[PDB]
Symmetry: D2
C-alpha cells in the first residue's frame, strides 16, 4: 500500500503537460525559423525524465534533449547548492534557446547554481520549467517561467520522483505513509 494519498492523478498530470506544451510551444514558435535551431531541453537526472519525455511530445516545436548527472558534496551543498558534475552536456549550448526541465523546486539552491553554470556557456536564452513547485520556491535566486503545479510542503513521490530510488515508475504523484520513511 504505502501510498497515503494521491496528490495528482495521471490524467491531471498529462492534461497540464499538454497545457504547458502549448504555452511553451507558441513562446518558442518561430525559433526553428529565425535561428534555425530547435528548443533545447536540459534535464538533470533522473527525477524529471518522465516529465521531459511527455513535455517534449506536448511541445509543438522541434525539441532536442540534453541530460546532466550530478551528485552532492556534503555539508555545504545544503547551503550553496554547489554540486558535483558526473555527466556534463554532450553538446555546447552557445547561442541556443535553452529550457531547464525540473521535476520539483523547493530550496532551489541547486537550480540556482545550475542556472549560473549554464549561463557561463553563453546561451541565447535560458529559463526554467518545473512540474511541481513547493511553498518555499519563492526564495531561490532564480525565476521560473513555467510551473506545472503548486504543491504543499509535505514530501511526495511518483512520476519520476523517488524515495530511495523507488516509486519513480508510478503514473501519478502522491504522498507516502510515514511508516515507510
Amino acid at each position: 500500500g504505502d501510498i497515503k494519498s494521491v496528490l495528482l492523478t495521471a490524467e491531471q498530470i498529462q492534461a497540464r503537460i499538454a497545457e504547458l506544451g502549448e504555452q511553451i510551444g507558441n513562446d518558442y514558435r518561430e525559433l526553428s525559423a529565425t535561428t534555425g535551431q530547435d528548443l533545447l531541453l536540459i534535464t538533470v537526472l533522473k527525477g524529471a525524465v518522465l516529465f521531459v519525455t511527455d513535455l517534449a511530445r506536448a511541445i509543438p516545436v522541434p525539441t532536442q534533449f540534453e541530460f546532466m548527472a550530478v551528485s552532492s558534496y556534503g555539508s555545504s551543498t545544503s547551503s550553496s547548492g554547489v554540486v558535483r558534475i558526473l555527466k556534463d552536456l554532450d553538446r555546447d549550448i552557445h547561442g541556443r534557446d535553452v529550457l531547464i526541465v525540473e521535476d520539483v523546486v523547493d530550496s532551489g539552491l541547486t537550480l540556482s547554481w545550475l542556472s549560473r553554470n549554464l549561463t557561463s556557456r553563453n546561451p541565447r536564452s535560458l529559463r526554467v520549467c518545473t512540474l511541481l513547485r513547493k511553498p518555499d520556491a519563492v526564495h531561490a535566486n532564480v525565476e521560473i517561467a513555467y510551473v506545472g503545479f503548486d504543491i504543499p510542503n509535505d514530501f511526495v513521490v511518483g512520476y519520476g520522483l523517488d524515495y530511495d530510488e523507488r516509486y519513480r515508475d508510478l503514473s501519478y504523484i502522491g504522498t507516502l505513509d510515514p511508516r515507510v520513511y
Copy 2:
C-alpha cells in the same frame, strides 16, 4: 515539416506494443527488491519511461552514458563510459532497455560488462530490431517490433540530435 518520407509506426501503434510486452514483462518478474531497468542515453529514454509505466510490477531506473572510441568501436564493442551506474547491481534482476539493435556490437560489450557486476539475472528488451540481430549474439528476451534495414527516426531516435521529440517512428528523406 517535409523531411519525413515515411511513417513506419504511429504513436498508437507504439503505445499498444509497450502495454503488451509491459504486461508480459510484469508477469515474468512477478529477490525481494524491484526490477531494474538500465538504459543507455539518449535514444531509449522515451521507451524506458513509457515501458516502466506499462510494467505492472515495481520498477527502478538507472542510466548509462557511453561514447565511441572510433576505429575500434566501429571494429567491435568497447565504448567509453561517460556515466556509470549510480548503484551496484549485484543480486539485482536487471533488464537492459535499448531502442534499436542493429550490429549489436555495443550491446554485446555492455552485456559482458554488466555481467561482471554479478547480477542475479540479466535480459534485454529492445523496442526495435533491425535486419541483423542475428549477426550478433546476446539473447534479446523482448522485441517490440522487428524492422527492415533502413535508417529510422522518431520516438527518442535521432539524426544529429533531431526528431527525438516526435511521438511516432518514421523514415527520413535524404
Copy 3:
C-alpha cells in the same frame, strides 16, 4: 635517446626545470606558510589532466607546507571551446573547495581561454583564495586576462613537448622540455 630525431632543440633541461620548481616551492611555501594556523586546512592543488601531472607531483614535493591533490579531466566541445574556453567536464573535483585556499597548477598558458573559464568556474564555488601557477607561459598569454601569480618560465611561441607536454600523447615522459622537428608535424 628516447625519441631519436623528433626533438629539434632542448629548451629547458631537467635540471633547469627542477631548480625552478624548488624556487617555486619555496616562494609558494612562504606565501602560504600561515595556513596551518589561521585556516587549519592544507593548500589545495587543483590540476587539469594531464599535461601538468609531472609538474604537480614535483611541485607538491617542493612546497614545504602540507599539500593536497585534486584532479580534473575536461574535453573540448569543438569550435566553441576554441572561442569561449568552455569545456566538457569529464571528471570533476572529488570534494568541494568551499573556504579552501586553492592553487591552480598549469603546464602551459597560451591563449589562456580554458584557464579563464576554469578559474571563473572554481571561484563560483567560493574558495577562500584562488591563484594560478603555470610552468610555462607563452607570449599570447598577455591577452588572456587571467592573473598568474606564479610563472616557471617565459618561453617563445614555438610548440614544445616534454615533461608532461605532448604531441598526439607522445613525449610526456621526457624529463626535459624541447621543440619538435617538423618531420613530426605533418
Copy 4:
C-alpha cells in the same frame, strides 16, 4: 617537519624509493625493449587516481623506452566494492587499448579486489599484453589471484602514508613513505 608529530617512523626514504624506481624502470625497459620496433607503439602506463600519481610520474621518467599516460578515476559502490572489487567508473580511458602493451601502475596491493576487477575489465578491451607493476605489496596480496609482474617493495600489513598514499587526503605530498602515529586515527 611537514607534519610535526604525525609520522611515527620512516618506512621508506625518498632516496630509497627513487633508487628502487630506477631499477624498476630499467627492468621494465629491458622487457619492453623491442616495442619501438616490432609493434611501433609505446608502452602504455595506466594508473587509477590518485594514490599512484607520484609513482607513475617517476616511473615513466625511469623507463628508458617511450611511455604514455592514461588515468582512470573510480569510486566505491559500498559493500559490493569491498566484496567483489567492482567499482564505479568516474573517469574512463581516453583512448582504446586494443593492441596496446599495457602496464597497470599501482601504489599498494593489499586485498587486490579492485585491481583484479580492473584487470579483467581492461582485458576485455583486447590489449596486446597486460601486466601489473605496483610500488608496494602487502602480505594479503598472496590471497589475491591477479599476477603482479613488478614489485617495488614488499612491506608489512601496517597502514602507511606518503608518496601518493593518504589518510583522509593528507600526507600524499611526502617524498618518503612512513607509518602514522595512532594519535592521528
